[PDB]
Symmetry: D3
Subunit: 308 residues, 6 copies
């Protein structure tokens, strides 16, 4: 009844998930035309099946999105019983409001495209904004890396009991206070004005910058300096989504981080070869278990505070 | 061509809006059956007209929402050219995410009810969260009290140039850092572990608590005490949406606030007689201008 | 697979139904904010389940409706397999047409709100107008109190074989002729012009006023007088939905009714303490059985002429 | 700017409407393939125009409905600004509820087909049931023959001031009590147990049978006999929608009716030559005025 | 779980399909009013069932379509689990584009009516244009008579290995080249300008005109003459949908066809009595098997190249 | 009132269109994040305006489609009166059917994305298949290069009166027979069994290969060889949509084409310097006229 498919050929995460569920990834004949159009053919019947499409870790966001939409459509019109999009890193998630400008809410457009392509269910991890669940009328399960983060901290940072959890911006406050409260430690916040201001005590403590994602790493790198100047003993960065585009890998190599921790929601293997500071938390088990629970009608909510 | 209607009994804001636009409120017979059902009867033709329904402030959120939905529907099925809901304080705005709970996203439900009722356009002020705009497929104009708040701060707080804008909670961080930046002053934040924790400096300076809304005022009143303990000269409370229900009005007086500043997005006339430190910023001009500009194809962004 | 939830704390009907199905009502953390906003939290997983939400008997129609919509939404986005609204008394049912005025069809708006909240199915009893089923695109089962009414009449009115079934208005004709034909008796009709006119013979017969609902009871009370003046031996009123708001309980106490019979679609316990003329027909079994049949894929139509 | 098109072959009503509005009917090539498929080809641009399609009276209900849906779609995809279906007699109106059966609500299906075809507005007359308006989310204007029926009664029945308005069935109760009230006369009702039963007084007075529609006229003809047996002076039959199919025309002559009055919502010209007691009320002026008023943002309620 | 219903009283195909599945057709009380309105009543419960409605072979396209829509609606609001329209010959399929005129895309309107009536799935055979599948958002299975055609040819035309497959028009090229390639033979094409032009060699070969449908047969009859004049040994016509309206049966009787082969997607029994040249390929097994596979979640795609 | 915006970087067509209409392109800041996400910011009010977005030609089909969808959405939620997508070459047009495969109908998906993004109207040229219009419920105007192709044939091929219009494949049959009919010349068709097969006569006459589009040009180049082998005097290739990616430009030169004629629905300026036999037909005037006529309620059919 269960059927798992991958996007593109960045199948590492997809294969890890399929492995954990005891399944082979479904056959897809999936190539890009000479004119950059993606052609897809589902190589097996999906009729009456519970289909899960895991979005590729390829960097080109528009290619990845279109491929996903196309595969959703193909499965729907081939009479799949249900089609679930498994989207570890939600595309255009940072474009979720107008911010006083004549801007698109591109995340709402993305949710609309997934809905009209025929998605019945979304599984995602750490949406940049939780309100994005409201952009759909279909159910969304928004998984958290938090339990895996708390675990990583307790086992890797000796001074975790006396550390400060630090938000790199104003929008991350609720997220760091939540980790701070669970660990029973302090929190601090950095706000960029072309200067950063820090509120909260980090003096003579380990500082852990926690964000949902880092892209060019300009922010986390400057925040690390700022934290050291404020007297933090050393600085960690823990992000769920490691985009690391453009100059990021250069910035990290030169930055005063003790370690930069990311999940494998985005493929990190190439980036790790050029950046020794990077460590990866595997989230394939969380994703596999959410898929398993979804299919069985069991509680996905268990995964919100517990690591499977 | 333009027609403005009001919700149930709270006419003050609606009448202020209509006055500024040179218009009388549209005729509507609005009431309640002995069995609590809302009756509404548009008392004039709205065929081919640009209709604006300004949501009532009877305080009872479900009655007010149902009355608005019913008026939208009646206008739509009476062949209005367009219907805009003008909703200064968006119902259920706080319920805009699951929060790790098996909870409704009631703000999205409310957006869907408005859309299915036939609204073509929404005008609102200081949405608890900006993503609520994305809960609709119809255009939403989200007005800001911010410019009127900053004006009031400068014109009423002598020591404003060196004060600190303070958030009652972790979630209000963005709102206070925006205000503090435009003033070029400092910010601080309070978090409830319970015990309250303060990050940032307020010592020997005026503290201004800024929130989008206050309900029971439990948080804002406890916040004010912590601020005083940390050596704030005087403490102010600025709220765009002043609901002030329950113990709120008494809690305010029993608190140290030099003043509690709210907008008239919700009626305050009753709560001002019972609380002397409350001051009101009139936003009827911001809303009238939004309607006029919406009607005329003119830029509403200017009001931001 | 089956899960029953109640609205508010007027859980009598809900508990009766749950009892009959051998179930406990599902856990809900359901409170009203200081600012009259209803906050709801489903206390157990509904993932993959057949959910039934029974609307509260609390009098405040807008609070009750909103609570119901909110619970439907919560269950839908929590991945319930199906969500059925069980709405014994359909709100705003009397606002189902324009009546030559610039009026809302509020019942159509209500049906639209239930549909967008995510209802897949409605179970209701004696819709004021059967056309209201057409206000939905989802299936509606409209149950009838008629079989329970016919039963009540045969067992409580000795002269049932020679009685007259009387409509209190023009809109109730089809409903009374139907009861009249089944009992093989006469029917009559009252029409209010500020005076009532009666067509049909009631002289020296027991008269039974049958309506779908009574609210302030102005109409049924005046109809009872009118029937006695026409020479009816005595008068009964049988309504399915007993709203009894405002002066109703005063009007009934002073009216010349032998008995006023209602169902428990709306809670009557408080109203009975102040009004001895009221008797209640329990419809929990009809509702429980429709829920049971719905869930099993069995015939709900059996209940249209038969009392379970 | 306004453009009026007609259905297949029944042009009389459509042409009457267009004449009153000072307009020629729009060019359309409408036919049927040898294999019964409806072909339609709008013969002029309707881009940016206010288009009114008046439904045809070829009698064949499914052909007429499909032709209307196709014309609506063609106008919509040719970028008409707005499309109104003008449907004097709403197809499948009688099928508006399940009636305790595993039955379709075909009137709702018809409403959905119209909506999906692209209709923005409906104009109709004497909907079998008023709730049918709620089967749509688009505006519906439901016109009344009532004022024209009352005029005709007074102007044609000498003894009208003391007559009785009678319903052929239990379901027509509201329709007859409304007419009887405005005239300040009595009403009565017939119900089929079969044997027919009469409630109300008709003795030594003129009886007027009033229904929204009559098909085979079995009910209305049997009703007329019962009324005569109960001592009605003379019996009239008033029907807004006169379908008169099958044995109806013969059954009418073979019956006692002093007259059978219908509107021209359905063509009657053929059925008037075969039945002399039939009289027609022209409703083209009511419909033209509704279109003109719909077009101009003027009050259609006035016509009620 | 499976339930099959027919439209009207042209139940031959429907009965054949029901037979092959081991089922009796469901009870329907289905009559036309004196005013040409179709009244329908489903005589048994369809609650929770997998419903298949097979569209009648009656000639009156609008009556047939409306009846089908009405039955779909009736089953949907009676809480069928799924409703599938089985439409062997898709109505208004030839009206699937604007053709430079101010024309309706009537096939898109038809697909929209089926969707709003509540169809969850369509089963059809040889859509005039495959793009018509794109007119729906629900899944469409478009079955092919091709495997049954190839079989008929191999067993009935001795010279099949040296024949020419001929398109009667420009729009049929892809269809004939496909049959030609599978049989490993030649293809040709006729194009009407008031004259026909033929491209491709048919000299001294058997010619097989293959089209999706024939209506008045003006085209195929003229094409047959043209093919004989070009030196074809003899001419066959194989259509999937035999409408044969108006003068068709007269035209065929006088035309130089060796045989005219059609499927029973449309009833042919009456037409065969007046036209001896007509032979019928039974497609009830293909339809029955697609229904069986649909219901079971098995591969319908097997039927695209294989005859069951 | 009318406002014209362009996609990312391909401005040439958009600027040609705006020039012909007497308009400057609307201000928009359009770019790409380091992480490939499309950023778009409408730089002026479009409230109450008739907005036309002309799709960009950066070649990367998914980037171009996403940028278009985002611009449509931004214009819609900024209260544009109407949004038209002007898409000379419809993305994924070739994927308009399953073709017996478990395949997407990606053209329908694309139509749905455009519709959900908020497009009210589409203008496009030479849809690969005419049924693609039915993939929408909004109006689509499908313009033709045909009249401009026929003009070019007569004005550039001396021996056109006795030439043969040839299809590269079985599917292009209708397109070539239409062209051949209007010219009153012959047609032929090529099919790939592989070995290529030719039906129809091309001996000692000029052969014109006509397709709606060519990508790698593998088919069209192999077609040209077969035509020469069959004794065609000279061979031309006419394509409304010239994608010309990969080996195409080299394959063309290495082929026998006297000329390869395309429209500028896709930029060609780079591919003309690298290939001398390419000629371009400007279609900016056809598209400008369609926008102007769409805006003014005038007949676009005239351009067909």
């Amino acid at each position: 009844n269960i059927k798992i498919f991958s996007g593109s050929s960045h199948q590492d995460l997809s294969q890890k998930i399929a492995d954990r569920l005891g399944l082979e990834l479904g056959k897809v004949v999936t190539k890009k035309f000479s004119n950059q159009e993606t052609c897809v053919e589902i190589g097996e019947s999906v009729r009456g099946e519970d289909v899960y499409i895991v979005q590729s870790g390829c960097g080109e966001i528009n290619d990845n999105l279109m491929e996903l939409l196309i595969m959703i459509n193909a499965c729907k019109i081939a009479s799949a019983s249900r089609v679930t999009a498994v989207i570890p890193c939600f595309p255009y998630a940072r474009q979720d409001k107008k911010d006083k400008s004549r801007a698109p809410i591109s995340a709402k457009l993305v949710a609309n495209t997934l809905s009209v392509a025929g998605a019945d269910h979304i599984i995602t991890m750490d949406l940049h904004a939780s309100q994005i669940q409201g952009f759909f009328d279909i159910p969304v399960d928004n998984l958290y890396a938090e339990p895996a983060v708390l675990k990583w901290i307790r086992e890797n940072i000796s001074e975790w009991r006396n550390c400060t959890i630090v938000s790199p911006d104003a929008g991350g406050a609720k997220r760091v206070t939540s980790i701070a409260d669970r660990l029973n430690v302090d929190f601090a916040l950095i706000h960029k004005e072309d200067r950063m201001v820090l509120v909260g005590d980090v003096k003579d403590r380990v500082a852990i910058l926690v964000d949902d994602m880092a892209d060019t790493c300009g922010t986390i790198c400057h925040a690390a300096d700022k934290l050291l100047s404020a007297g933090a003993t050393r600085v960690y960065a823990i992000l769920t989504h490691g985009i690391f585009s453009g100059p990021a890998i250069s910035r990290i190599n030169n930055a005063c981080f003790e370690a930069v921790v990311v999940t494998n929601t985005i493929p990190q293997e190439d980036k790790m070869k050029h950046c020794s500071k990077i460590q990866v938390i595997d989230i394939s088990m969380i994703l596999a278990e959410a898929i398993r629970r979804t299919h069985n009608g069991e509680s996905v909510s268990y995964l919100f505070s517990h690591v499977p």
